[PDB]
Amino acid sequence: EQDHAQTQEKLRKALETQIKELQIRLDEAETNALKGGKKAIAKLEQRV
Amino acid sequence: EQDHAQTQEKLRKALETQIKELQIRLDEAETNALKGGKKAIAKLEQRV
């Protein structure tokens, strides 16, 4: 059971690196998708 | 060692849920900025 605990110990640190990486990749997108649309909507405001 | 692991098996089920709600936001980035959303960009395209 210790060996089953061992991989279950290792996967926890192997899964905590997901919540550190997916969070910062999310935060990069939501600023980028906002600034992506805001620049996209402004030109079509500017040309019209 | 069993029940202490049984508490830790609850935390693994806790985080794999928490992965998916942060994973579903990666789908949300396709139209995330809804207060300036995609359709409002699309309607301004039909104007010009």
- B41 and A41 within 8 Å at the Cβ level: the answer is yes
A44 touches chain B (CB under 8 A): yes
Rounded to 5 degrees, φ, ψ at B11 are -75, -30
Beta-carbon contacts below 8 Å between A and B: 68
Return d(Cα A2, Cα A25) in angstroms, integer: 35
Return d(Cα A34, Cα B29) in angstroms, integer: 9
As a residue count, chain B comes to 48
Return d(Cα B34, Cα B36) in angstroms, integer: 5
Resolution value, angstrom units: 4.2
* CA distance to partner chain A, nearest, from residue B9 (Å): 8
Return d(Cα A40, Cα A31) in angstroms, integer: 14
Residue type present at position B4: H
Return d(Cα A36, Cα B9) in angstroms, integer: 41
Could you tell me which of A31, A30, A22, A6 has the C-alpha nearest to residue B18? A22
- B29 and A34 within 8 Å at the Cβ level: the answer is no
Inter-axis angle of helices A2-47 and B2-23, nearest 10: 10
Return d(Cα B10, Cα B6) in angstroms, integer: 7
